[PDB]
Structure 1
Amino acid sequence: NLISLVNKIQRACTALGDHGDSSALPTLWDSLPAIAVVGGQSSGKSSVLESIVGKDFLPRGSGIVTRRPLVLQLQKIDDGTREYAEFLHLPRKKFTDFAAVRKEIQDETDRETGRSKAISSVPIHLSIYSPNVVNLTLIDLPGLTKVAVDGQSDSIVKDIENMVRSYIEKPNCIILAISPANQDLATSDAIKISREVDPSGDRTFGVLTKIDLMDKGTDAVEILEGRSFKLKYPWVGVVNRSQADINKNVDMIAARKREREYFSNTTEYRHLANKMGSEHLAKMLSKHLERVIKSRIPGIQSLINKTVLELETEIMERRSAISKRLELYRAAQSEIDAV
């Protein structure tokens, strides 16, 4: 629920104070103890924010059809199966039919970019509350490429590793390196960049998607044993919904009763079985973020010090401006204060 402080903040911020108000960008930054999820194209980010949401909602692209930021805030709810989700985009309105919030996304995206990729680097706040998922805060970054293909441009190349390394440079968001597993990890565009900033591992968890489709006479152990690309935390093995199934329409729900069936009932990791899977990770993520948020709230006094550099310190273009620039930091306190 604390994870939802950041969110109860956060939004009410890119609600107005997404300007960068001389010194009112100083929040969606520190305030962003919130995992960033990176994965070079075809990695699997697109999917794991669907089995960590146990519901569709992303416009599917095994190449790329998601070319934006994306602040995904979750929230458990009192077992009263009122699912739904909102948007800062569309104010005070509610969705239900996820498969058409997977068109709204596909549509806000299209209000600048295209059918085959352009440039747009300003967030997309969507909060999903759902009885059967974990209180948390994600931010989707688009896949990481090195070959400028089609009627794309040729900065797309170093313009995505731009975007990425600057939602990553921020010493607050935790890195989440999705690196599929029919390729070596000594090749992770993810890990390569995950190590660029944070050679320390202080923020950074391994994901490693796709294994059912990994080789034969190979398997996945020495990472979830943590012996090859040993990570400061551990690694977390997932099985998402194969291409095989996304076309077969497969629900998200009985999808997880499938990845379950996997490691519990597949010789090779029948023993690692319990620290693996969508359902799990989250429980973990949320846990390792809460610590983070928590252990980082005397961003009060460091919150509570950028107020009087205003409130008690006053053509008139910035007086027509500090009329926004403050409400934020004040809406801030109470939103903490309270609980």
Structure 2
Amino acid sequence: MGNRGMEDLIPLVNRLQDAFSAIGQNADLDLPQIAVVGGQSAGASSVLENFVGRDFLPRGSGIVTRRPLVLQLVNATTEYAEFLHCKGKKFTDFEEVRLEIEAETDRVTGTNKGISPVPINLRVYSPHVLNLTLVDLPGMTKVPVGDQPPDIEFQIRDMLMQFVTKENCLILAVSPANSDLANSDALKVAKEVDPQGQRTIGVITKLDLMDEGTDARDVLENKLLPLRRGYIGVVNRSQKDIDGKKDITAALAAERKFFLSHPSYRHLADRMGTPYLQKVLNQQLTNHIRDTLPGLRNKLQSQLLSIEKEVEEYKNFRPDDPARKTKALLQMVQQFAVDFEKRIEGSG
């Protein structure tokens, strides 16, 4: 478990914040939010929790993500979690967090596969995290089931648009490997909000459920459908694994063996896996934080220039200074005589 690529980026945020906080101003470290987009049963929830590094989300077959979950990571001296609707309560075990998520979902949506556009806000504190916003959205569908109205498609789409048309947001498009990539819904959305692929990152899931004799080699090599940032293959847990409480360590080891042994993927074994997706995202934050430094320097540079002309004199102040008093006297008298002539004569 855990995400150790944050450690190299936490102090940079602290140092810059301490730099501005001393002057009574805050640092515009507007780190982007990460939205996970995909279709029903694509694997989005499994992907997202691997970036957080904690096992707390609900996952499995069926419509499990019935409400948008917004996770806010906050740097803190101790690790704990809390909800907005459980004010005054403290969560010290993520299993309780997962159960609360299901309970809060059913209380509003019912049990017959309902949805609700009102999100759930989870705030996890920890010393090993940045101040990040992570969004876990419901998957998209075509036809209603259970109590879903005829317009279930568009209600889900609007929930999606509110979080992906927002600037400064990484779109993490997850698609299954055992379905034709031309018929993925994630990529249809990405190419409508991010035409040039500057934000979009593709993930290919379910590489271990391919039909025998077929592979995704022309996908992971960015040949079938060119994507600016390429595709990353991942092998998450199976539904049996979820119900079997399979450990994370075993899942990662199996993912490593898979890519190292599959004949069509060995030459890409180092571009794929859970840890590589962490590295790409972390590197994506680091590029953003370092791309904003020029603005911060210019702000401080402008302020010094404005203040410098006066503090040059204040720093040399001595109360016993006849020269200052007489210089002040000549300035006041010259100001009065100019103001006086202005009002009477019209000069100036």
SS of equivalent to 1:253: helix
* Counterpart selection for 2:239 from 233, 236, 243: 243
> Which one has a larger percent strand, Structure 1 or Structure 2?
2
Return the alpha-carbon distance in structure 1 between the equivalents of residues 295 and 243 of structure 2. Answer: 47
CA contact (8 A) 2:114 2:146 kept: no
* Counterpart selection for 2:118 from 98, 118, 121: 121
Q: Which residue of 2 aligns with 1:274?
A: 270
Seen in structure 2, the aligned counterparts of structure 1 residues 295 and 90 have a Cα distance that, compared at 3 Å, is farther
Is residue 35 from structure 1 mapped to residue 31 from structure 2 by the alignment? Answer: no
SS of equivalent to 1:268: coil
Give ranges in structure 1 of 5+ residues lacking alignment. 10-29, 304-339
Instruction: Give runs of aligned pairs for residues 171-210 of structure 1, distance below 5 A.
Output: 171-210=167-206
RMSD of aligned C-alpha atoms? Answer: 3.3
Seen in structure 2, the aligned counterparts of structure 1 residues 262 and 124 have a Cα distance that, compared at 3 Å, is same
Seen in structure 2, the aligned counterparts of structure 1 residues 157 and 64 have a Cα distance that, compared at 3 Å, is same
Is residue 286 from structure 1 mapped to residue 282 from structure 2 by the alignment? Answer: yes
SS of equivalent to 1:118: coil
Seen in structure 2, the aligned counterparts of structure 1 residues 155 and 293 have a Cα distance that, compared at 3 Å, is farther
Give ranges in structure 2 of 5+ residues lacking alignment. 1-5, 18-28, 300-348
Letter in 1 for 2:121: I
* CA offset digits 1:290-339 (Å, max 9, x no partner): 323553588989x9xxxxxxxxxxxxxxxxxxxxxxxxxxxxxxxxxxxx
Q: How many residues align?
A: 277
CA contact (8 A) 2:70 2:119 kept: no
Instruction: Give runs of aligned pairs for residues 86-125 of structure 1, distance below 5 A.
Output: 86-91=82-87, 94-115=90-111, 116-125=113-122
CA contact (8 A) 1:3 1:289 kept: no
CA contact (8 A) 1:241 1:255 kept: yes
Seen in structure 2, the aligned counterparts of structure 1 residues 99 and 226 have a Cα distance that, compared at 3 Å, is same
Return the alpha-carbon distance in structure 2 between the equivalents of residues 69 and 84 of structure 1. Answer: 21
Alpha-carbon shift at residue 128 of structure 1 (Å): 5.7
CA contact (8 A) 1:180 1:209 kept: yes
* CA offset digits 1:98-153 (Å, max 9, x no partner): 2221101112223422222132333513326486x998542111111111112111
Kindly, what percent of the aligned residue pairs are identical?
53
> Which one has a larger percent helix, Structure 1 or Structure 2?
2
TM-score relative to the length of structure 1: 0.71
Letter in 2 for 1:67: R
* CA offset digits 1:160-203 (Å, max 9, x no partner): 11110221111221111100011111111110111111111011
TM-score relative to the length of structure 2: 0.69
Return the alpha-carbon distance in structure 1 between the equivalents of residues 130 and 251 of structure 2. Answer: 18
Q: Which residue of 2 aligns with 1:211?
A: 207
